Design a protein around this ligand. Structure first.
Ligand SMILES: OC[C@H]1O[C@H](O[C@H]2[C@H](O)[C@@H](O)[C@H](OCCCCCCC3CCCCC3)O[C@@H]2CO)[C@H](O)[C@@H](O)[C@@H]1O
Ligand SMILES: *C(=O)/C=C/NCC(O)CC=O
Length: 265
């Protein structure tokens, strides 16, 4: 594979879409590779990691409990609720809802959690509280993936999302237990984790949350590194490409291949 930046450019050319990417040292925040890092991209389901960061902050403050059982109804369900549709009778705990939202991309679980933090506006206020003045959530689970051209709703930038993920996982804004929990939910992703491991060389750590939307929108927020360590945050978003899901997945994997082959920088 060519150098990371060269591969990212080739991906735009081949997809006829915009790619946004940041490679950041998790421990220090040093930005290593950046491309359209300050441009806007729909977050799609990747917003679920920030959502659970807001939930964890409420737990730390004594305003929420991961054990709290939420009983919900069938009319509360939205498109794609693999886990939540199975618990209409017994409900799910707040912690279970976060595991479902992050590890299975369960949309109803995400919406139930979103309401507890004050809806899209409340999650946006949490982002401003931790110093992210760019990322914004405006709609609910299904509707936020529309990715209309030029629509700033439900967007982030690679740079803001990477900085926000680092703040949630390592800045001590969240308690030690909460930082560990958020990381473990990413490590446990069932949608893409196993698939990524199947193509990663031996020795590489992966934790992640992916997302997809209209007009080719696709994205992943991840922790990656050799020697089985979460060395760097890697955020890649794609938008406005007519390419098949398979080719968008392949182009993202290709950027990963470039990073892996040329990791020392
Ligand atoms: O010399 C480096 C490596 O070259 C190949 O590894 C390939 C691997 O066989 C292929 O499957 C992968 O595709 C890339 C898979 C990327 C997976 C996901 C990346 C995500 C993770 C973080 C966020 C963005 C993308 O590339 C590597 C590097 O060329 C060899 O198979 C491997 O033994 C060797 O150690
Ligand atoms: C999180 O990103 C959920 C996205 N749902 C929309 C789709 O999966 C459709 C992608 O083509």
């Amino acid at each position: 594979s060519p150098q990371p930046l060269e591969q990212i450019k080739l991906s735009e050319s081949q997809l006829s879409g915009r790619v946004g990417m940041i490679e950041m040292d998790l421990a220090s925040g040093r930005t290593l590779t950046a491309w359209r890092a300050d441009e806007r991209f729909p977050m799609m389901s990747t917003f679920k990691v920030v959502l659970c960061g807001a939930v964890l902050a409420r737990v730390d403050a004594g305003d929420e409990q991961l054990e709290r059982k939420i009983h919900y109804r069938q009319q509360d369900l939205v498109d794609y609720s693999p886990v939540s549709e199975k618990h209409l009778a017994d409900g799910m705990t707040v912690g279970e809802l976060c595991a479902a939202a992050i590890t299975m991309s369960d949309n109803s679980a995400a919406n139930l959690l979103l309401a507890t933090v004050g809806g899209p506006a409340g999650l946006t206020a949490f982002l401003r509280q931790i110093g992210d003045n760019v990322t914004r959530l405006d709609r609910w689970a299904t509707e936020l993936n529309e990715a209309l051209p030029g629509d700033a709703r439900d967007t982030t930038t690679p740079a803001s999302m990477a900085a926000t993920l680092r703040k949630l996982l390592t800045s001590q804004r969240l308690s030690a237990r909460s930082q560990r929990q958020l990381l473990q939910w990413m490590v446990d992703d069932r949608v893409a984790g196993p698939l990524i491991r199947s193509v990663l060389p031996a020795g590489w750590f992966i934790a992640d949350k992916t997302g997809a939307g209209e007009r080719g929108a696709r994205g992943i927020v991840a922790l990656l590194g050799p020697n089985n360590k979460a060395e760097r945050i890697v955020v890649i978003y794609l938008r406005d490409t007519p390419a098949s899901m398979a080719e968008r997945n392949q182009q993202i994997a290709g950027i990963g291949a470039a990073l892996i082959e040329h990791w020392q920088r």
